[PDB]
């Protein structure tokens, strides 16, 4: 959510598996910005650890599991020889002639130059939250600001209602 | 509290530190919750000297077995409560784990300080490394040698 | 052929057999005579149990002798064995009995696995495709638990060397998983299957064939590790070990949770502790599950037996008002709205229902233990005359609710089916409703074991007398709501997956078509149609243990009872119009089916059709004529070319036009003027005419193992 | 009741209601009734006790039930004085007969006891001890966090309850949980620094940040004592820096340091003696151990005897190893049954070990085909042969520590050496010395699978050191060479990727300095290979595109070679943007994915699809996707097929018609429902674009593809569109 | 709809406020909801679906649905041997949805959620965002520290069938935080 501009985690977007705990997200989109086509995801905070799902992990379940998790998908996907940022390109390709179709607009294709450069820059902030999240010199990351900014109750109190901020 | 009446009542290679003896007393009084001389207050409460090793474990500076911290009690600590393990814990002052840490320290300090021809075989290959071919005439020259196999197999 | 009648008469005359096998001179002659005549009476083995068992035993005593005699006994053995495999599996199909037919597979396999027999090996290895593929279907299937082991254990013990299973391997990995799932020869075989593999394969091979199963496979090993045998568990430690890293690979799968989704607490008895001056609830759930596992299972002491049918039976009590009085029970039933009231046409539908609650599921386990023990010989003098009063004490409370003076407001005129009929978490019924009863017998009749539904038909007959004594008459009787949840809750049997299950389902619909009148009959027909169809569908393919023979008989029955004209005493206007209406349906339906891609089906629906015509009178044509509406698209074919669908729906479809076209007055005339028309006849003519090979090249005939059908 | 309807029914309906068979049914119904009214409760309890003697999970699921509601109707002075007695009695002795029980009776009685309201309490080692003994684990931990949250997470009993906590976390193998803990717990900033190190492979930085803890505690233990609350970190700093020395290869400075006198460490000694050939050490750590280890070491114990037997100099004892495997694996799989039964990161010790032991016994029937009487013999020979492959296949995973790749290869390794001084002592058979060079091949493979297991796992100095290991070896084969060699590159690529230029010279050197003319020419293609990657990071792109070049012209067959030299022209593209840079790095990525190994050439044909939106007007990215796209498996394009058709909606879709038809050929499924649902929302659109309409060509395409699939597949077409047809009723 | 109709006229006054409408939405939608639960739960193929119940391993060589999302490493593809008879009404995603089970030639039963969706655009930014899911999963599996966390996206199989409907891979189990 944070790191792929995603739109926002809604509870009821969330599906807990009974069975086995595995949650998936019905569903994630790009958060496309319609009037300029860049991303945002500049959200009061960067993802749902809201306070009953911060009593659920609790604090050592938070701490421990959860911020080692983030840090360790960061340092995964930073790998130079996965080449996660041609995936990021061609997917985002896809995503930024949807969005020309659903704005701007044998049809004519959109702008090369226009296509390229949002792709580009979309692709960078993708990369930079990652490469910011990855960096773990000095035994100290990003991953825990972001993790207390996520469970602050002075960004959850400026979140949507309908987030439920509480929940 | 008194226990119902029921039908079957009658009517050591490392040395021992004085953390390790005080645990291993402490253990014994409260959780098994026996006299110093192990007699049996109630019949459900046995003696269980693998809880024992447990708890001597937890900061012991060695592996304690069960048989050990039993012999240890009884053929020690029986002896010096009839200066007690109290006396001696309080009057050591943490100094003798504290110096047991200093040395594993020491110890630990010690260990870390403690710590041309290649154009030839191109040329036998063909290749004129300083005139690179595209991408392009590579492929073609890679399809015209599949070519000339598939003709040579058939 | 005398001697093997006389054999069946004096077993002990299978000694001079024995003898003619053992001798070297006559032990090739005498097997060849032997085999020759029991291939001969192979179909028998499925139906005639003592000339089952007699030649299964036979068959043992040839391949005992190819086991003594290998020369010229596996030359003999050798060209009966494709008609051996190959005709055991296709008629285990059909066949009353099938276990006999995997006991001589299993026989067969015992024989060839002597390992020195190649010239078997090399005879085998066409069959194991088709043999693989067959007994991969059968143990994914839903079977009793010995013909699952057996068919796992035919599975592993194939009589092949392992380099040539290599193609098939991937269909032996789902009872690989079975057998380590199963009893403890069963996981000795599994085991021992996997560590040949292990050692025989190379790893990333065997590993990208586990992967299917590899979840499941890697639990199955980690609970093998917990087995109180000390070879089983050594084993699959050992095959662990030899796994290396892929032991502890992530599952994607992960290890299923145990999750309790209710909030409310199960029923419970109350006990009172007199010295305390206070009372506690004691939770039932649990053990009317212990009391249900003990009376369903064969290894259970009798004293226990006992112990569980007296915690079910003070449960049952427990969990009912015993308010009733005799003068305020009579009182109530005398009422004349219960001999004069019009019934409320009020239907009853567990479509409406939601799950369980905690009390309905241990309501329908306690009757389902119940009625066990009504059927259990040492319980039965006891059990049985419970299980009759409670099955009348049911049966009067939903009299009593459903109609009278005091019919509650979801049964009022008017009233849809909805979810107050039941006992919910949400809106509910007022206490548990009595339809939880017919749950039982359902459960009941759906059984594994047969034997139940004999206290499921004497439950409905119970039902059956009390609601005709209270209501005044059969026909007031089968007006009741209930019995639409009876119909609808019997024929979901026959939509449940297992052959056992339809059967119950076969077995309550013909029980129903011959006790209740025959106005509700014509009533619920098309429904017991539908039901009946779908049992011959849906074990297309699978091993029914007479499931579909018995749809079949209950099926001519149901049409003989329903079209057979009435008497000129018994033409009442209403009955004449039920039937004829009833008629028209069932007509509908069978007609449509006429060119139905599945075979039994389709010539049900013939067989049917014809049986009607001979029941009225009536011609075939006559029949069909209001209904060939529903025909026009499909006599000819006209919105698709035959080349485009597949081989069945082609024969169902020709078929379909061979029945209706040579009827006596023909219901439909072919002409060749139209489009349609001659496009059929020209398409019908080129696959007359054309080679196998012009046929194979088209897409749609490209599978089938042969063009002849 | 039957005649509960009346008392639902209304006043008035009540107010108005004020045969011989039915008086008969209703008379003996009365007299049922009357039978049942009879029924007591204590006779269901009489049934029910006899199914709680039958049946073990109603009985614990019963006790569960029960004793709370019990300890609810007791009385406050009752329930103090029953808590008072239990806590004692969950520690008797009489309970370790239950042990192994599945469950233990005081498992269930400890599960019912937490029900209860009020809570009793339970002290945390005791809490502890029962979890690890009794199979309670996770019920234990449990308690112990709603204690500590309780308590706020120091006094001393927070001070126990954390310590039961983390002792309860270590023994799980939750490494995380346990990290949590010590960080929020800890008193030295070095200790969360060392470990957050840890707890992400960073062994070096760890062990570092554990000495300046330690030096920081000694400088501070000259001012004043320690206090016992200090003590716990003091013994993590210790069990850690061991555990990151184990990590980083340090097996000689362990055993010196097991050995120092006055604070000898038997245990670690038996653990890292064997792996540096001290079997000297060994026995007398075995010694000291076997009069007083922990029961759940025994198996290792056992293993580790084996070990002596087949190993030490002179006291080699064959005979043993079938009873000591049987030992070990009998007490390994004892305390698998301890464990919890749903199988987590507690289990993966047994898990390992059951290769270690089966890897025990075939080692032992290598050393017995190594006997002067059976050496030479050809079953000897097969079975060695046989096992050395075994082997070389059966390795651990990329998530296992590297201690445990060590255990493995370096039992291994002393195998090897084995067959090695067998056949290298007797030369009477084998006169070609194939037996000798098989034990060398086998030894010089497992080094560079454990020198390349330490790079993948970030250990870049650690598996440079161990890599060259290889030198030491008098003779090895080529292939092992090049091994070597490739492994050192790819370090050095590695270490490039954080420091820059000097580890790029450092892997141009070593490329430069290897004699290509033993090597062959798919090896000679990959070193060039290796040395376009390195030029390319150096910015010298000439130089970089010449070893490209020979690379490809060496072996046009290398995968990497066509891969990497696509990037370079990639990068070299976006920047530069002349489009022949463009269609050189579409045919570069294209060539690579000429194989069936989807996983690899997935990263490449997004390159490919990346680069097609620098396409001119005239398509010329296009027609080289076109022209050099024959070749690659169609299963290729299964994952990008949404891509696939955007790109087909677009101008490029002409040019690209063919690669799509391909593989809805090969896959039709995969691409109808795509293609259909693509071409029902371009009918959608221009239906709403005019509010017949001529089909657009994005259209004419789409129709085209499907017209095909019905073509080919024209029964399977049928039913996947008579599903589709009937999801309307849904 | 002429109750509806005349609560929802915005000529009246103090209609166009949004939290009025929102007070008008909540009470209609508790209406709905109570009508809703009077529904019947689950429906049998052969009502309505023919094709369905008929279906066989003998009609075509059918893939479950998803199956070629991401190309499985071996041919080892599940095919549809039978749609199970009952079809289950369910409230997932806030939308009355249709749970079909397919039964696979290996036995298992597959539950498939049928969805319809009014808005195109979104349905297929959804699936690109699976899609990059899918795609970034491998990599999870390749590396230490990812490896030993079990760390793993979920993403179930979404095929869409038709620009309105599209076939899901439910887990019957799943319950969303709200
Ligand atoms: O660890 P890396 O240097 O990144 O490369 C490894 C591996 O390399 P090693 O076997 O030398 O450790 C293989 O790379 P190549 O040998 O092919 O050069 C390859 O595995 P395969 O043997 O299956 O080809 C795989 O790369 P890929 O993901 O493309 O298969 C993988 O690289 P990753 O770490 O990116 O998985």
Not at chain 4, 693 to 703: F, G, K, L, Q, V
Request: glycine content about 4%.
């Amino acid at each position: 959510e944070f790191v792929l501009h995603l739109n926002r985690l809604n509870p009821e977007m969330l599906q807990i598996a009974q069975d086995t705990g595995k949650l998936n997200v019905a569903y994630f989109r790009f958060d496309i910005n319609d009037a300029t086509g860049d991303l945002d995801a500049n959200r009061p905070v960067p993802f749902r650890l809201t306070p009953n799902i911060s009593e659920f992990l609790t604090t050592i379940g938070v701490s421990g599991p959860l911020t080692a998790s983030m840090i360790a998908v960061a340092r995964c996907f930073a790998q130079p020889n996965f080449k996660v940022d041609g995936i990021l390109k061609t997917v985002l390709r896809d995503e930024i002639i949807a969005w020309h179709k659903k704005t701007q607009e044998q049809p004519e294709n959109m702008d090369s130059q226009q296509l390229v450069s949002l792709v580009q820059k979309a692709v960078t902030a993708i990369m930079t939250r990652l490469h910011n999240l990855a960096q773990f010199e000095g035994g100290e990351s990003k991953v825990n600001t972001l993790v207390a900014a996520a469970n602050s109750l002075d960004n959850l109190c400026r979140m949507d209602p309908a987030w439920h901020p509480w929940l | 509290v008194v226990p119902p009446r029921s039908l079957f009542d009658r009517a050591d290679n490392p040395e021992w530190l004085i953390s390790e003896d005080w645990a291993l007393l402490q253990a014994v009084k409260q959780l098994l919750e026996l006299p110093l001389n192990l007699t049996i207050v109630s019949p459900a409460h046995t003696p269980n000297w693998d809880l024992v090793s447990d708890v001597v474990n937890s900061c012991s500076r060695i592996y304690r077995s069960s048989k050990q911290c039993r012999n240890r009690y009884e053929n020690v600590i029986i002896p010096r409560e009839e200066l007690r393990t109290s006396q001696i814990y309080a009057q050591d002052e943490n100094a003798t784990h504290t110096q047991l840490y200093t040395s594993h320290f020491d110890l630990m300090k010690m260990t870390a300080g403690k710590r041309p021809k290649h154009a030839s075989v191109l040329a036998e290959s063909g290749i004129n490394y300083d005139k690179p071919l595209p991408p392009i005439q590579v492929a073609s020259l890679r399809a015209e040698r599949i070519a000339k196999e598939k003709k040579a197999l058939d | 052929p005398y001697m093997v009648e006389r054999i069946s008469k004096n077993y002990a005359l299978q000694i001079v057999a024995n003898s003619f096998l053992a001798n070297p001179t006559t032990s090739a002659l005498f097997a060849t005579i032997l085999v020759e005549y029991l291939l001969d009476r192979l179909p028998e083995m499925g139906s005639n149990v003592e000339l089952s068992n007699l030649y299964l035993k036979l068959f043992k005593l040839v391949f005992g002798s190819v086991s003594l005699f290998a020369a010229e006994n596996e030359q003999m053995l050798k060209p009966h064995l494709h008609k051996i495999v190959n005709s055991s599996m296709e008629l285990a199909q059909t066949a009353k009995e099938p276990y006999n037919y995997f006991l001589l597979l299993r026989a067969l396999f015992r024989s060839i696995g002597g390992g020195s027999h190649d010239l078997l090996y090399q005879e085998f290895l066409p069959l194991l495709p088709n043999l693989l593929q067959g007994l991969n279907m059968l143990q994914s299937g839903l079977h009793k638990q010995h013909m699952k082991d057996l068919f796992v254990e035919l599975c592993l013990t194939v009589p092949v060397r392992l380099s040539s299973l290599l193609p098939y391997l991937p269909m032996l990995m789902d009872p690989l998983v079975s057998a380590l799932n199963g009893s403890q020869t069963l996981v000795s075989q599994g085991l021992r299957t996997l560590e040949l593999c292990v050692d025989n394969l190379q790893p990333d091979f065997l590993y990208d064939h586990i992967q299917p199963v590899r979840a499941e496979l890697m639990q199955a090993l980690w609970r093998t590790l917990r087995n109180p045998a000390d070879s089983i568990s050594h084993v699959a430690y050992r095959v662990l070990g030899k796994f290396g890293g892929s032991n502890r690979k992530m599952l994607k799968e992960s290890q299923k949770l145990h999750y309790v989704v209710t909030e409310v607490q199960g029923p419970s008895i109350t006990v009172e502790f007199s010295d305390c001056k206070a009372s506690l609830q004691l939770p039932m759930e649990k053990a009317i599950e212990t009391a249900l596992d003990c009376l369903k299972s064969a290894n259970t002491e009798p004293y226990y037996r006992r112990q569980a049918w007296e915690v079910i039976k003070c449960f049952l009590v427990a969990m009912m008002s015993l308010e009733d009085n005799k003068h305020a029970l009579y009182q109530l039933l005398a009422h004349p709205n219960f001999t004069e009231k019009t019934i409320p046409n009020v239907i009853i539908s567990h479509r409406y229902k939601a799950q369980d609650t905690p009390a309905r599921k241990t309501f329908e386990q306690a009757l389902t233990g119940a009625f066990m023990s009504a059927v259990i010989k040492d319980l039965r003098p006891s059990a049985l005359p419970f299980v009759a009063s409670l099955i009348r004490h049911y049966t009067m409370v939903a009299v009593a609710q459903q109609c009278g003076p005091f019919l509650l407001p979801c049964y009022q005129v008017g009233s849809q089916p909805s979810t107050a009929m039941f006992h919910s978490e949400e809106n509910g019924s007022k206490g548990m409703d009595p339809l939880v009863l017919i749950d039982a017998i359902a459960i009941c009749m759906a059984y594994e074991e047969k034997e139940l539904c004999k206290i499921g038909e004497v439950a409905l007959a119970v039902i059956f007398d009390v609601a005709s004594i209270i209501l005044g008459s059969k026909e007031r009787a089968c007006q009741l709501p209930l019995f639409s949840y009876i119909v609808e809750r019997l024929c979901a049997c026959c939509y449940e997956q297992a052959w056992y299950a339809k059967l119950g389902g076969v077995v309550s619909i013909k029980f129903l078509m011959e006790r209740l009148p025959l106005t509700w009959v014509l009533q619920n027909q098309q429904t017991f149609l539908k039901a009946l169809l779908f049992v011959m569908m849906d074990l297309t393919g699978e091993v029914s243990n007479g499931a579909v023979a018995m749809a079949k008989t209950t099926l001519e029955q149901l049409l003989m009872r329903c079209a057979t004209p009435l008497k000129d005493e018994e033409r009442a206007e209403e009955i004449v119009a039920a039937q004829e209406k009833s008629f028209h349906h069932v007509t509908h339906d069978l007609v449509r089916e006429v060119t139905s891609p599945n075979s039994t089906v389709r010539k049900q629906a013939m067989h049917s059709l014809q049986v009607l015509a001979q029941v009225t009178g009536k011609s075939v044509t006559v029949i069909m004529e209001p209904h060939k509406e529903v025909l026009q698209d499909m006599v000819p074919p006209k919105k698709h070319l035959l080349r485009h669908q597949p081989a069945n729906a082609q024969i169902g479809l020709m078929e379909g036009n061979t029945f209706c076209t040579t009827l006596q007055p023909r219901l439909f005339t072919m002409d060749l003027n139209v489009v349609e028309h001659k496009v059929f006849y020209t398409e019908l003519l080129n696959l007359c005419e054309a080679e196998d090979s012009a046929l194979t090249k088209l897409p749609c005939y490209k599978s089938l193992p042969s063009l002849v059908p | 009741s039957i005649t509960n309807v009346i008392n639902l029914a209304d006043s008035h309906d009540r107010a108005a209601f004020a045969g011989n068979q039915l008086h008969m049914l209703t008379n003996r119904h009365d007299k049922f009734l009357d039978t049942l009214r009879e029924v007591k409760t204590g006779a269901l309890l009489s049934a029910f006790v006899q199914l709680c003697h039958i049946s073990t999970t109603l009985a614990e699921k019963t006790w569960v039930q029960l004793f709370p509601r019990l300890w609810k109707i007791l009385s406050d002075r009752q329930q103090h004085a029953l808590a008072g007695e239990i806590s004692p009695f969950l520690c008797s002795g009489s309970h370790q007969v239950q042990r192994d029980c599945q469950p233990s009776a005081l498992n269930c009685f400890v599960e019912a006891m937490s029900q209860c309201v009020p809570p009793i309490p339970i002290r945390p080692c005791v809490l502890k001890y029962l979890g690890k003994t009794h199979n309670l684990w996770f019920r234990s931990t449990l308690m112990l966090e709603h204690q500590a949250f309780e308590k706020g997470l120091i006094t001393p009993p927070q001070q126990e309850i954390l310590d039961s906590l983390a002792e309860l976390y270590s023994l799980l193998q939750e490494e995380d949980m346990w990290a949590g803990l010590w960080q929020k717990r800890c008193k030295y900033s070095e200790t969360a620094t060392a470990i957050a190190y840890e707890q992400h492979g960073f062994f070096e930085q760890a062990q570092e940040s554990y000495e300046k803890a330690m030096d920081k505690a000694k400088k501070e233990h000259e001012r004043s004592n320690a206090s016992p609350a200090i003590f716990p970190e003091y013994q993590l700093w210790e069990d850690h820096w061991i555990r990151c020395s184990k990590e980083l290869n340090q097996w000689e400075a362990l055993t010196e340091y097991g050995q120092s006198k006055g604070h000898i460490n038997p245990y670690l000694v038996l653990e890292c003696a064997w792996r540096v050939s001290n079997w000297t050490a060994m026995k007398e750590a075995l010694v000291q151990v076997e009069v007083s280890c922990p029961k759940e070491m025994a198996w290792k114990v056992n293993m580790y005897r084996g070990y002596l037997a087949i190993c030490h100099p002179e006291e080699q004892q064959l005979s043993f190893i079938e009873r000591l495997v049987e030992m070990a694996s009998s007490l390994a799989i004892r305390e698998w049954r301890r464990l919890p039964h749903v199988v987590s990161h507690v289990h993966t010790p047994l898990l390992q070990a059951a290769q270690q032991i089966i890897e025990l016994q075939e080692a032992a029937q290598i050393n017995a085909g190594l006997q002067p009487t059976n050496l030479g013999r050809n079953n000897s020979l097969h079975d060695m042969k046989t096992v050395v492959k075994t082997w070389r296949n059966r390795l651990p995973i990329v998530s296992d520590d590297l201690s445990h790749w060590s255990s493995i290869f370096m039992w291994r390794q002393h195998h090897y050496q084995a067959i090695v001084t067998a056949y290298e002592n007797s030369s009477q058979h084998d006169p070609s010395s194939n037996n000798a060079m098989l034990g060398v091949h086998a030894s010089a493979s497992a080094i560079i699978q454990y020198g390349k297991i330490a790079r993948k796992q970030g250990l870049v100095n650690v598996a440079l050191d161990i890599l060259s290991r290889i030198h030491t070896i008098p003779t090895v084969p080529i292939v092992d060479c090049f091994q070597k060699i490739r492994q050192q590159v790819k370090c050095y690529l590695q270490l490039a990727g954080v420091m820059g230029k000097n580890e790029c010279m450092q892997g141009l050197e070593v490329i430069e300095s290897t004699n290509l003319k033993y090597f062959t020419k798919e090896m000679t293609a990959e070193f060039y290979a290796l040395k376009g990657m390195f030029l390319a990071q150096i910015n010298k792109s000439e130089e970089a595109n010449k070893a490209f070049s020979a690379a490809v012209q060496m072996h046009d067959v290398l995968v990497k070679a066509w891969a990497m030299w696509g990037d370079y022209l990639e990068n070299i593209f976006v920047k530069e943007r002349q489009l022949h840079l463009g269609v050189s790095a579409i045919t570069c990525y294209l060539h690579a994915c000429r194989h069936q190994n989807e996983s690899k050439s997935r990263k490449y044909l997004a390159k490919v699809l990346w680069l097609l939106s620098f396409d001119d007007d005239k398509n010329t990215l296009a027609d080289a996707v076109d022209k050099y796209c024959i070749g690659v498996p169609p299963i290729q394009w299964l994952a990008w097929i949404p891509q696939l058709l955007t790109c087909l909606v677009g101008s490029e879709g002409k040019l690209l018609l063919n690669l799509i038809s391909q593989v809805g050929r090969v896959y039709p499924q995969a691409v109808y429902f795509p293609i259909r649902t693509l071409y029902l929302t371009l009918k959608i659109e221009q239906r709403e674009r005019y509010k017949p309409i001529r089909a657009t060509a994005p259209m004419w395409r789409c129709s085209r593809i499907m017209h095909m699939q019905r073509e080919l597949h024209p029964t399977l077409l049928s039913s996947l569109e008579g599903i589709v047809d009937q999801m309307v009723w849904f | 709809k002429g109750q509806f109709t005349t609560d929802f006229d915005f000529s009246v006054p103090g209609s166009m406020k949004l939290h009025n409408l929102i007070s008008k939405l909540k009470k209609w939608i508790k209406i709905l909801e109570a009508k809703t639960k009077q529904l019947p739960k689950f429906f049998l193929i052969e009502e309505k679906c023919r094709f369905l119940s008929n279906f066989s391993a003998q009609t075509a060589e059918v893939e479950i649905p998803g199956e070629f999302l991401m190309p499985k490493p071996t041919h080892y593809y599940i095919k549809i041997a039978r749609f199970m008879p009952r079809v289950e009404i369910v409230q997932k995603h806030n939308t009355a949805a249709r749970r079909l089970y397919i039964r696979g030639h290996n036995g298992k039963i597959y539950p498939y959620l049928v969805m319809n969706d009014a808005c195109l655009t979104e349905s297929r930014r959804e699936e690109r965002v699976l899609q990059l899911l899918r795609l970034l999963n491998p990599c999870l599996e390749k590396r230490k520290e990812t490896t030993k966390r079990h760390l793993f996206f979920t993403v179930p199989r979404v095929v869409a069938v038709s620009p309105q409907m599209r076939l899901v891979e439910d887990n019957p189990s799943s319950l969303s935080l709200v």
